[PDB]
Paper text:
The immature flavivirus particles that bud into the ER lumen display prM/E protomers in which the pr moiety binds at the domain II tip to cap the fusion loop, avoiding its insertion into the ER membrane. Maturation into infectious virions in the trans-Golgi network involves an acid-pH-driven rearrangement into smooth particles made of (prM/E)2 dimers exposing a furin site for prM cleavage into “pr” and “M”. The flavivirus particle’s life cycle includes three key steps: 1- budding into the neutral pH environment of the ER lumen; 2- transport across the trans-Golgi network (TGN), where the pH is mildly acidic and where the particles undergo a maturation step before exiting to the neutral pH extracellular environment;19,20 and 3- entry via receptor-mediated endocytosis into a target cell, where the mildly acidic endosomal pH triggers E-driven fusion of the viral envelope with the endosomal membrane. The fusogenic conformational change of E is irreversible, and the consecutive steps outlined above require a special particle maturation mechanism in order to avoid premature fusion-triggering in the acidic TGN during exocytosis.
Here we describe the X-ray structure of the soluble E (sE) dimer of TBEV in complex with pr at acidic pH, revealing a crucial role for the 150-loop of E domain I in relaying the fusion-loop capping role of pr upon secretion. Crystals grew at pH 4.6, which diffracted to 2.6 Å resolution. The X-ray structure, determined by molecular replacement, showed two pr molecules bound symmetrically at the sE dimer interface, each contacting the tip of domain II of one sE subunit and segments of domains I, II and III of the opposite sE subunit in the dimer. On pr, the surface buried by the sE dimer is 1328 Å2, of which about 80% correspond to the “capping loop” (CL) (labeled in Figs. 2a, 3a), so-named because it caps the E fusion loop, as described in more detail below.
Residue numbers in the entry:
A (entry chain D), B (entry chain D): 1 to 80
C (entry chain A), D (entry chain A): 1 to 400
Amino acid sequence: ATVRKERDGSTVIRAEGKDAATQVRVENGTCVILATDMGSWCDDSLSYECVTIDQGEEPVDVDCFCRNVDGVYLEYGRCG
Amino acid sequence: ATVRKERDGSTVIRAEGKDAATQVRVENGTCVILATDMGSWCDDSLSYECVTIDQGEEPVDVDCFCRNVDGVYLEYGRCG
Amino acid sequence: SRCTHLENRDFVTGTQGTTRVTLVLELGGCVTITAEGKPSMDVWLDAIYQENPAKTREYCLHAKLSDTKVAARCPTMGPATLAEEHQGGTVCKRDQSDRGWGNHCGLFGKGSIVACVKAACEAKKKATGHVYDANKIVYTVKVEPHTGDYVAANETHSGRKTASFTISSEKTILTMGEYGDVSLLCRVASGVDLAQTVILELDKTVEHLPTAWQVHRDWFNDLALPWKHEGAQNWNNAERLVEFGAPHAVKMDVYNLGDQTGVLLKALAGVPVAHIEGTKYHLKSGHVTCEVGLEKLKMKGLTYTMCDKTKFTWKRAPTDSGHDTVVMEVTFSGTKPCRIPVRAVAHGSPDVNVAMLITPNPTIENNGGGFIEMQLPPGDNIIYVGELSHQWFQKGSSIG
Amino acid sequence: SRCTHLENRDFVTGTQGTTRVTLVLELGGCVTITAEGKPSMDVWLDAIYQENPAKTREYCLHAKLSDTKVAARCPTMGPATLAEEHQGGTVCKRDQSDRGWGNHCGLFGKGSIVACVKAACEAKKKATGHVYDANKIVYTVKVEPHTGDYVAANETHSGRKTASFTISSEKTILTMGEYGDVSLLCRVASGVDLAQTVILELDKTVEHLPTAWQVHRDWFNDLALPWKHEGAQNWNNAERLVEFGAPHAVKMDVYNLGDQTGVLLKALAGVPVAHIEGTKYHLKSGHVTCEVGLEKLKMKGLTYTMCDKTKFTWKRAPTDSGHDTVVMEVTFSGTKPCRIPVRAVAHGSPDVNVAMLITPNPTIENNGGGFIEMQLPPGDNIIYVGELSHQWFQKGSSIG
């Protein structure tokens, strides 16, 4: 997984199939990617928020969540 | 256009786009191929009789006709 | 003759005095005109076409979806936006998602969710149209002597003449060689608003399909597909090939609605399949009305010698033409050119000629010649080509 | 807690004596069981699935047509054949064509014409099915203490226990750690013949589509597409994706009927989209009926000290849960472990506790702890977590 801090304050994790069920460290925080339908990078993509979960809270209805890092976004391609 | 005398007495002309509106000599006879939708050889093919027209008769509703040669068949692919 | 072979063949047999004949010529049919002291001509509507017709809108049969973005806001945090909503190259959906503490909201309730996708078209997956203009259509009418004379040397139709008309130029005189002149005044009758007739094509893929279809513009404009005019940046009504999934807290999937080729082809079953010959777009059905002028038609080979009675052979013996007439071909061993001594008699009446000839003065040319066509009364007849005979039984009434 | 977040959340509040509780657990919903002197448990139907279900027939969405042959006979010359007629890998059509002298027939009339084509399927253009078996389905029921305690160190759900049942094995006892034991006797009720339930998938192509759909076997078997059983040489009903053209003298074109993906997906709009997790094929909808046994459930942290009244802070102040209950989280600065002094009072009655606790003995653990859930009467109340107060107004009746 690649991490980039897009100049508009924001941050974007670009993940693949290999990145499923893994921990990625972003800034001082960490994000967990659970997205099952991931593939190689391409046009057939999906981009959405990777929610900051307040310390000691169970994530609910999210397949990408962060701790100690705000404004994280997830993007993945569905090729291969 | 290639001409082959398939052992079962029969004869088969295999034509392409280049062979449209041309004369091909088969045995002692000659055949005229007028088929407009012709292409490169492939699976998407069409095979049908190339009618023997009796000497001095106008061909009607045929896009492949022969003179002085019987049992001629036309095959072409529709690729490219 | 090409005309003898057609299911839709009509006869027009003028009288000794008739010089003008009114006819409806339909596409795919023919008319055999017979006039006394004149030869027989085969007249037919060969085509109604327009070259380079104005393109209509184009439709998308298969959408190429990409760069899907989902934006979400928490309950009481107002609405979620994406700039892609006020953009033409996209499809968007506003919905609400269940939110709470475990998905970064201080409140439990429904929160705003928006998903946007970039909609384009797949390569080779467009259905294109062209519309007609009465001001630009051309209609081709052919005339050929009904003699059954073909130049099977250079594979050329002998004596065939083509007259091209437009809405303005709708009068012509064709020179039938040694047979004189035939005048045509043809008025096209479409019955259908040509400006409301569309020819539909699909971009070629690997499967083999019909060339095109002739559809009504009403229908074509009502197709439930994204559309655009050639040159436009984006597709209009791109939302017709997109389906949004159930929204999760901050994610909402965007799906494709599949290739619409099958859908469209199901609709086109029973629609007339039309032809395109390069720049020429053809109306599959239509007709024209002509006033055919025969006054300047002259009989060929009048001063020719009469063929020797004993020099005949059956090339093709009397057979039913499929139009209540009898056709045949003879081979003449003697010296050419000459006029054929053809007649028919009903049993019991040797002295009466019953043959109403569709080919009025059959001649044996030094090239072609030998084809005779005739109408015979019902019953037992004997056909004579000189001394050469053949019995013929004629079926009663008509099987048409 | 996951359960607090769900739209379909039901409450079961037992009495002092109740030990057995009967429940219907639906997929996608949850139940919070509260019993006096016992802790609260969140019970839910997590899945109804079958691993490696029997494959049904497979259908062809796009036919690959090839090696088209046309055979024709002259009028009165009997019928035209091709061996391909008594073969399974083909589609054939017998028709009649107009014949005459100019197409090698001595007679003018209709002659026999047969066209045959080789029908297969395109790569990745199959729709496959799998059917269920009540004898092989498995249903997973989860139980977790309703305390809102998560190990956000190793991202593990603390105290969550999974019971797997089958039609035979439909009884279980789950050990809830330091909370004792909960017994479950679950009977699956499909309502739908599992042997008449099919899960439908489409071979992946470039477009993004739903995983699968849960359809009735009746419907699936009535799809107007060629079909076959995996392993079969040829497709049955291959004629469903073929269209024969108008026969010419000796030629008759064979066309494709297009990709049926769009057609099928139009039919699947409003059909529940189902999930597949490897070998596990999931029923999108269903429910189970359990008899939940609470007799062996013990209250955790009974002999713990009571938390100092002044050491509390609001982590998350009272908020509506969306189910007519109030949820909150506290931060306790003092020494752990201990029992929280939580109560609520209605204005005008300082001495009466009105808090009907959904989390019966809230404790501050040396790890987690601090979540309180309660039912409060309508009107103005004050919530107390020791000396820490917060006003709460409770909405009348229910908005459900």
